[PDB]
Ligand binder design. Structure first.
Ligand SMILES: Nc1nc2c(ncn2[C@@H]2O[C@H](COP(=O)(O)OP(=O)(O)O)[C@@H](O)[C@H]2O)c(=O)[nH]1
Ligand SMILES: [Mg+2]
Length: 167
């Protein structure tokens, strides 16, 4: 019987949650994916030569029953922001407190994902900024890009699973 890791992809709208999720599950880049669907994805994944089932909810939207459950029984979270969106970085703390509130814990597995690093000519959030925010929350930091050709999409999800397994 394989373990099932339930993960939640959270972040402001337009940071690339859907694109990163589609790139991880379907291995294609879908630009301008409709911003409103909040769906979940399920597939068998091999991480560190150990197979597992990944139940990932791509968040969107007020209140949602599906979002509510996945936040409660989730095992790990992906706090995603866009390096071109300063407000998406400003809400990293807000998303950090919501997870710790929903889970009612002082620390829970999460990784800080800085998306859209392919747009270097439009980058507003720096690597030192993301590293400092990650160091403050004591969580891993990684830079991703869902646009073709992708960068670190699998590693972002795999590193969260590694954090879950190490606890
Ligand atoms: N350049 C670049 N654009 C991206 C990337 N990820 C998403 N986008 C674009 O950003 C827009 C919003 O992305 P989306 O996946 O809908 O973000 P979401 O609303 O949080 O799910 C889309 O038009 C995408 O084409 C990326 O890694 N690089
Ligand atoms: Mg989306």
């Amino acid at each position: 019987n394989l373990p099932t890791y339930k993960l939640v992809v959270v972040g402001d709208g337009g940071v690339g949650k859907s694109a990163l999720t589609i790139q991880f599950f379907q291995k294609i880049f879908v630009p301008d994916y409709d911003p409103t669907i909040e769906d979940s994805y399920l597939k068998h994944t091999e991480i560190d030569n150990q197979w597992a089932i990944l139940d990932v909810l791509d968040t969107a939207g007020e209140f949602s029953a599906m979002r509510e459950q996945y936040m409660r029984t989730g095992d790990g979270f992906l706090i995603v922001y866009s390096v071109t969106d300063k407000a998406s970085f400003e809400h990293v703390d807000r998303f950090h407190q919501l997870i710790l509130r929903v889970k009612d814990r002082e620390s829970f597995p999460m990784i800080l994902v800085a998306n859209k690093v392919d747009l270097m000519h439009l980058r507003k959030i720096t690597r030192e900024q993301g590293k400092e925010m990650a160091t403050k929350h004591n969580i891993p930091y990684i830079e991703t890009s869902a646009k073709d050709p992708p960068l670190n999409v699998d590693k972002a999800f795999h590193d969260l699973v590694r954090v879950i397994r190490q606890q």
